[PDB]
Amino acid sequence: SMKTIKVKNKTEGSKVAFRMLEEEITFGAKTLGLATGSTPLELYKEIRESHLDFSDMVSINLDEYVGLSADDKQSYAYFMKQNLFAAKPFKKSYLPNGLAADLAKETEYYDQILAQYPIDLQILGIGRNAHIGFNEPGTAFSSQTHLVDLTPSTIAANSRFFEKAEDVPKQAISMGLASIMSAKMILLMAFGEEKAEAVAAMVKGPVTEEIPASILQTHPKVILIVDEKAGAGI
């Protein structure tokens, strides 16, 4: 089941997401899966300014860059601190350890954290090419937490923030598509013309690894919050 809520713009969609989030908490949600990127930024702002209280709750993020500490300003840990956790801390917030000595031990660890704390509500965006998290076209639907080689476009974009070419992460530790699908409820937010092709492929195309988001067709409880421009093809 995929319900679609069509909204005017990102501001409106973010407010709908907030109301839905509050309701899930009121009805007992305890573990949240969180998103990075620009998609959830207005949602996070609304949460920071709200009366929500995450003190008895757990959060789990999808990804961290290999080679970055949680204190590094380019890390997803730091992004989450700035945008959410400084204002609204959780009982515990998990992200992969980018500094892990053994990346295979770290991927196994993260899978076990997901088993220990199954996610009640996952907030998600969609990529222009229908990627989900760091899972690009071709990713197996069976994938659990895994090491991802960043796309060259991503590396080029991120390079602008480092010394220091040797310092630019080339990999991430990322929740896989099977990992993400385990959430009891998924809220996918998509805004702008740039997302329209991906949204149409997700909703109307075949289920195929060429379109990572297409696996969401098979999830029992996905709600799509899409503005008019992102929803143009559905």
* 232's tokens: 């143009």
* 198's tokens: 């991906």
Name the residues annotated as catalytic: 63, 129, 131, 136
Size of the chain in residues: 234
Which residues have CB under 8 Å from 70's CB, separation 6+? 77, 78, 95, 98
**Tokens 């080029």 — which residue?**
156
PDB experimental method? X-ray
**Listed resolution, Å:** 1.6
| Residue 172 bridge partners (DSSP) | 65, 148
Distance CA 208, CA 130 (A): 11
List the domain boundaries for the chain.
1-234
CA 211 to chain CA centroid, nearest Å: 16
| DSSP collapsed to 3 states, 166-208 | HHCCCEEEECCHHHHHCCCEEEEEECCHHHHHHHHHHHHCCCC
- Domain 1-234, CATH: 3.40.50.1360
The answer to whether the CB of 232 falls within 8 A of the CB of 225 is: no
